[PDB]
Amino acid sequence: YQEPTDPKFPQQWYLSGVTQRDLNVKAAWAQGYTGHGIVVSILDDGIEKNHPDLAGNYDPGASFDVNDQDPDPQPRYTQMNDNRHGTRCAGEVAAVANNGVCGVGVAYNARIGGVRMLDGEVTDAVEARSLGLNPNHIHIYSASWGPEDDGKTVDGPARLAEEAFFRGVSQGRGGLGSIFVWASGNGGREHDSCNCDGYTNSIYTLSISSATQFGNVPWYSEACSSTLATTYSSGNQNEKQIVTTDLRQKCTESHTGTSASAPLAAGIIALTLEANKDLTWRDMQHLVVQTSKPAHLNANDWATNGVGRKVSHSYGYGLLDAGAMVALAQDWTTVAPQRKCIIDILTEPKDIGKRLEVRKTVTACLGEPNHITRLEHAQARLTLSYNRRGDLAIHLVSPMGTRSTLLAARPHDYSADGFNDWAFMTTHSWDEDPSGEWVLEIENTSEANNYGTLTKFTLVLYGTA
């Protein structure tokens, strides 16, 4: 093995770095893992398959055009370069190495495809078709779509896309499960809270946020409990950005935002799957939880959970660490069957007013086939009315004492629609024992005299025994 010779590899600071402050990818490459035999697909605005840094790894089997209903995902060219995004992301995962062009992908011997699906009317059906493309050929899908990041919207996948996620993790990859890697959002300026985005807030998506070069939470970041982990992206004008393949056969040094983080995660996950091709979609999430690193990341909300792991709403479990992922993968015992324990918490509706606390001691399906002693994801499915949605903050405390923020104040959100059986998800209690007293807190963070009612609280616990 030799370090890549590509002309912009030194500029790929999140990989080539020798300041400790990187994704630890060289360590995986040096162990011999570069993505061989793994297939990744970018679900976005298309892919420039003839790009000099992509063509060598391009895989028609991983690509389709859902907008035009044909096999060729080539993007449309416009003056504003609207359809540059998929090509940028594809390069992050799998740009060719050692070919004197631009930089390299994290998984530079992986095969890369794209689905052209954003350049047209994006319906539920379009989404489902993209998520379900060739599920026994493609291992890993990477995407960043979701509701407008205006800090006012609550929305997620409709029925067909939800069913495709489920079919994907259930039946995809010969039963091991499609790995759906997701960006958590770019609505930071608008105080958006990513549990209001049902794509990233899903248990089926392995969700990723960003850190700046100097290890800070970028302006565009959204915090939420559903995020699992972090990769580097852009920041302020003194901090470097993402260097990758661009539209028109170019090399950009200015790829930005959380949408640039998901593809780096996708690449790391490809290296990890190469290291253990029998990892299931849940195994992969477990690896990310166990091996991600808080160390060099600055946040004001780091907290240690019931099993001793540091976790943040901006960063999840911290920065992905490819070396550690590959290492743990090689020793990993695949997890037991997923259990789901559904607990109806409320016996009557509760007035919210200025503040509401709901406490309930649960057995987590003790005595039954869905008894859970080792949590993975938890959801609080809430139905409530409120006069000004964004003034609410909502927290969930596990019996072991871990406080998850389910919803932070979203000052721009003046909706009077409340939440209709909305599943807020947290990863922060992973591996805890969910038996005992859970506490739900709903608070009016404004000085306004606000009012509403909580009419349903379903606690949904996932995990093993």
429 included as an active-site residue? no
16 binds Ca ion (CB under 5 A): no
* Of 136-144, 200-208, 255-263, 363-371: span binding Ca ion (CB under 5 A): 200-208
CB 47 within 8 A of CB 75: yes
CB 89 within 8 A of CB 142: yes
187 binds Ca ion (CB under 5 A): yes
6 binds Ca ion (CB under 5 A): yes
Which residues, listed in sequence order, are joined to residue 206 by a DSSP beta bridge?
Answer: 181
> In the bound complex, what is the minimum distance in angstroms from residue 210's beta carbon to Ca ion?
13
Task: Write the binding mask 147 to 176 for Ca ion: x where contact by CB under 5 A, - elsewhere.
Answer: --x---------------------------
Tokens of 86: 């998929």
22 binds Ca ion (CB under 5 A): no
413 is in an annotated binding site: no
- The residue among 181 and 365 lying less far from Ca ion, judged by its C-beta, is 181
> In the bound complex, what is the minimum distance in angstroms from residue 6's beta carbon to Ca ion?
4
113 is in an annotated binding site: no
Task: Write the binding mask 206 to 225 for Ca ion: x where contact by CB under 5 A, - elsewhere.
Answer: -x------------------
Element (H, E) at 420: strand 419-426
Mapping DSSP onto H, E and C, the string for 5-43 reads CCCCCCCCHHHHCCCCCCCCCHHHHHCCCCCCCCEEEEE
205 binds Ca ion (CB under 5 A): yes
185 binds Ca ion (CB under 5 A): yes
d(CA 281, CA 101): 33
- The residue among 207 and 212 lying less far from Ca ion, judged by its C-beta, is 207
d(CA 250, CA 52): 9
d(CA 164, CA 135): 10
d(CA 171, CA 358): 38
d(CA 177, CA 8): 35
Looking at residues 72 to 131 of the shown chain, list those that interact with Ca ion (rule: CB under 5 A). Answer: 72, 96, 99, 101-102
How many binding residues for Ca ion (CB under 5 A)? 18
36 included as an active-site residue? no
* Of 55-63, 199-207, 272-280, 335-343: span binding Ca ion (CB under 5 A): 199-207
3-state secondary structure of 462: strand
300 Cβ neighbours under 8 A, 6+ residues apart: none
Q: For binding to Ca ion (CB under 5 A), which residues are involved?
A: 6, 53, 65, 68, 70, 72, 96, 99, 101-102, 149, 185, 187, 192, 197, 202, 205, 207
State the catalytic residues.
44, 85, 259
